[PDB]
Amino acid sequence: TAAGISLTGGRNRCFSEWQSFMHCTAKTDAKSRAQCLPNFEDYMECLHHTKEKARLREIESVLKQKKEGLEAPPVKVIPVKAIGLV
């Protein structure tokens, strides 16, 4: 089996969540198995980023509904040629 192996032969992007969920399933039984629901949730989150996309949708909706200015250290986009300039 190639499960857990990344494109470079190491551990794939979501290996940690999957391994913690597998630890959970190994320690519990069929009756207790639902106790492992959070771990599996985290695993699926890593796979698909669904809650993260929802949270970003919420933040962006509130952002585009604001005319007041933002005063925080910002993000700046630069050309690849300008990596390290100035």
């Binding site: 949730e41 985290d42 993260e52 509130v62 952002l63 933002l70 993000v75």
Partner: protein
């Protein structure tokens, strides 16, 4: 390979320092955008307590 092994810790330490800095920065930015609204910006989307640098930014 052993030369790269001996350089790995300092490069990863620098990168970890940057990961922390930018993650905390993004949390501060988002909580400032969400000020005045009923939404927790500090609540993780994961259930474990572990540090999770963001994937998935808003396009700049």
């Amino acid at each position: 390979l052993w030369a790269r092994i001996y350089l790995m810790p300092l490069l990863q330490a620098e990168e970890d320092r940057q990961t922390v800095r930018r993650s905390i920065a993004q949390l501060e930015r988002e909580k400032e955008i969400m000020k005045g609204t009923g939404f927790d910006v500090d609540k993780s989307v994961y259930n474990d307590g572990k540090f999770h640098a963001p994937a998935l930014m808003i396009p700049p």
